[PDB]
Amino acid sequence: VDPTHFEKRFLKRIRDLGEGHFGKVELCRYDPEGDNTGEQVAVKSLKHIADLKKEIEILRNLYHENIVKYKGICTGIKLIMEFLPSGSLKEYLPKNKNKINLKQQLKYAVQICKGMDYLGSRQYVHRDLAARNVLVESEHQVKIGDFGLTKAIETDKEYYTVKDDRDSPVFWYAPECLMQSKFYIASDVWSFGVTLHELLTYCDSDSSPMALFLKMIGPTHGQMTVTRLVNTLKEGKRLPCPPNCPDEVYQLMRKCWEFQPSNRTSFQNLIEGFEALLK
Numbered sequence: 001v002d003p004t005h006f007e008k009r010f011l012k013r014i015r016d017l018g019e020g021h022f023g024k025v026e027l028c029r030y031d032p033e034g035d036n037t038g039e040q041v042a043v044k045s046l047k048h049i050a051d052l053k054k055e056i057e058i059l060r061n062l063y064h065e066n067i068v069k070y071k072g073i074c075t076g077i078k079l080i081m082e083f084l085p086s087g088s089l090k091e092y093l094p095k096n097k098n099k100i101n102l103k104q105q106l107k108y109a110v111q112i113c114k115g116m117d118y119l120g121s122r123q124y125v126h127r128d129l130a131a132r133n134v135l136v137e138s139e140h141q142v143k144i145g146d147f148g149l150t151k152a153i154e155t156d157k158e159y160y161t162v163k164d165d166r167d168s169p170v171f172w173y174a175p176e177c178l179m180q181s182k183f184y185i186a187s188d189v190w191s192f193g194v195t196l197h198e199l200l201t202y203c204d205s206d207s208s209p210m211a212l213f214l215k216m217i218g219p220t221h222g223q224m225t226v227t228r229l230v231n232t233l234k235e236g237k238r239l240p241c242p243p244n245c246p247d248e249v250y251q252l253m254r255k256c257w258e259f260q261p262s263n264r265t266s267f268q269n270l271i272e273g274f275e276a277l278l279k
């Protein structure tokens with residue numbers, strides 16, 4: 001018997017956890033005994049097969065306490081992951097403000113950075129780092145929860161050149177990704193800076209990177225939105241300091257948003273910077 005082999009017949013659909021354009025994740029019960037006592041699992045399916053197969057192979061081989069656990073496959077193929085009942089920071093933060101203070105926020109930040117630095121050391125760029133993809137394991141632990149856009153960087157090359165970019169999360173993206181479709185580890189650092197802004201605003205929809213940028217550049221530009229975004233970033237405009245966020249935290253955030261990738265902070269430097277603020 002293979003414990004990572006999940007039979008489709010026992011995999012009971014409960015609800016949607018999220019989706020992209022081509023894939024979806026659902027909460028399911030794997031219930032082989034049929035009595036509703038089976039384990040809850042997160043199941044990723046296509047709504048492209050080769051891409052999901054690559055994602056499975058990446059995730060199966062990542063081992064870090066801040067990276068969501070692979071459980072198996074169902075075979076067309078589905079990825080089976082651990083289900084985290086507290087959900088993402090998007091669900092958790094708005095419901096738990098009273099519980100979660102700046103110190104815990106900075107601990108989550110460190111954990112995301114550690115997860116990401118592990119990923120980078122395996123020569124991967126993530127390309128989709130955002131609060132909605134950060135899972136809450138407990139009040140004291142988070143995990144990177146999705147790897148749908150994750151790509152290997154070729155050895156002795158510094159970046160991945162993207163071809164499919166229709167559904168890019170532009171408001172989380174560094175200027176080089178917007179302008180040239182080149183994706184660096186430094187590009188993941190930029191995205192982390194935005195993700196940190198979300199964490200500091202408790203994922204409030206009205207303070208979201210999209211809502212805020214569209215206020216800055218104008219919401220009615222259609223196909224010209226990305227050029228206007230790039231232009232606004234060229235001018236040196238950035239997301240503003242979240243309420244109640246100390247300038248020292250905001251400055252670490254700003255080093256994530258240097259225009260040139262070469263001048264950005266790294267995940268190692270962020271971890272040092274946050275750990276210093278904690279003790």
Ligand SMILES: CC1(n2cnc3cnc4[nH]ccc4c32)CCN(S(C)(=O)=O)CC1
Pocket residue numbers: 017018019020023024025042068081082083084085087088132133134135145146148
């Ligand atoms: C990470 C995820 N999610 C939300 N709550 C979760 C709870 N447990 C999860 N296990 C794996 C993913 C996962 C969860 C939310 C966002 N998506 S996506 C990229 O399709 O928009 C996947 C599922």
